[PDB]
Ligand binder design. Structure first.
Ligand SMILES: Brc1nc2nn[nH]c2c(Br)c1Br
Length: 328
């Protein structure tokens, strides 16, 4: 009873238990022998990802082979992806398969011909940023409405085909179902995209974590500083945030939620005023920054998770009016 989401708070409790009780989920595991691996795309602590071809129909796909011991976590990701079926700009799960001999599981996703983000983010126009952020927000509003927090929003997990103008939010392996008053593990998200709640060990967080991460992405795009908050470790990450948002403002947040602050911070936080967002503007980024971009950003990058815009409120902001007009 410390904090709850302003939107979609009870949505899982209003659904059948089967919807959110992923430990009880029984996937249907098809045959990986239908897929030919063509090229390694990446590796992570839990998986390796390959471009592949379905030899039965010639479809190009991506196969994520799961390090197989994490059974509850596999069920979680599979159930989440089933529940998100058809969601706007969510990567499409085509099938759940196993090597028929070893029984190692894998997930098969639609292919996206993505443009490497480091390159891409140096060439985006003002309209491009509005467009891609609006499309990403559609995915977040969808998953939040489905009772799910992504918990790993970051540029790599936002595939963008800049030629076909397609965006997909990938890598649901850290995602979780939101339940009011539930305490969650704070060891989620990439360092640079972790909300202050995670950095101060506040476990009663919600969908608004993803809105901090989105705000970090927005700042990086309009200001051309990627990542925007570049901490050296989790402690320094909060310091970098506080140098922008201010230290007195941090303490007000902690007091509101009765958050205990790890005393190692006492020696490193210093004293910082809250900075004006206009301080980040210079000749190299001025064409990407508007009053409406800064107003939106200011309402996303807030310590107080409750006061951040929801994905829907963000979509409704004037910054996106030019995109809505084109889509209509
Ligand atoms: Br899922 C997925 N994961 C990837 N990792 N690197 N490129 C990737 C693509 Br494209 C997809 Br689709």
């Amino acid at each position: 009873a410390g904090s709850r989401a302003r939107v979609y708070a009870e949505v899982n409790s209003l659904r059948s238990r089967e919807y959110w009780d992923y430990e009880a989920h029984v996937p249907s595991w098809g045959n990986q022998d239908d897929y030919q691996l063509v090229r390694k795309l990446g590796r992570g602590k839990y998986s390796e990802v390959f471009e592949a071809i379905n030899i039965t129909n010639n479809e190009r796909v991506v196969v994520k082979i799961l390090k197989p011991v994490k059974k509850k976590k596999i069920k979680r990701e599979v159930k989440i992806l089933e529940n998100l079926r058809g969601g706007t700009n969510i990567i499409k799960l085509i099938d759940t398969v196993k090597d028929p001999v070893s029984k190692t599981p894998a997930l098969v996703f639609e292919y996206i011909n993505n443009t490497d983000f480091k390159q891409l983010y140096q060439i985006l126009t003002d309209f491009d940023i509005r467009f891609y952020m609006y499309e990403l927000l559609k995915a977040l509003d969808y998953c939040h409405s489905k009772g799910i927090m992504h918990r790993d929003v970051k540029p790599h997990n936002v595939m963008i085909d800049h030629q076909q103008k397609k965006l997909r939010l990938i890598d649901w392996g850290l995602a979780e179902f939101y339940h009011p008053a539930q305490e969650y593990n704070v060891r989620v998200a990439s360092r640079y995209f972790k909300g202050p709640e995670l950095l101060v060990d506040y476990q009663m967080y919600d969908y608004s974590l993803d809105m901090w991460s989105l705000g970090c992405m927005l700042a990086s795009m309009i200001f051309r500083r990627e990542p925007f908050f570049h901490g050296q470790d989790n402690y320094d990450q909060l310091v970098r945030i506080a140098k922008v948002l201010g230290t007195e403002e941090l303490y007000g947040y902690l007091k509101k939620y009765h958050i205990d602050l790890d005393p190692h911070f006492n020696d490193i936080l210093g004293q910082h005023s809250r900075k004006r967002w206009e301080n980040f503007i210079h000749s190299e980024n001025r064409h990407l920054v508007s009053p409406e971009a800064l107003d939106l950003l200011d309402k996303l990058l807030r310590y107080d998770h409750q006061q951040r815009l929801t994905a829907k409120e963000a979509m409704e902001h004037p910054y996106f009016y030019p995109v809505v007009k084109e889509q209509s």
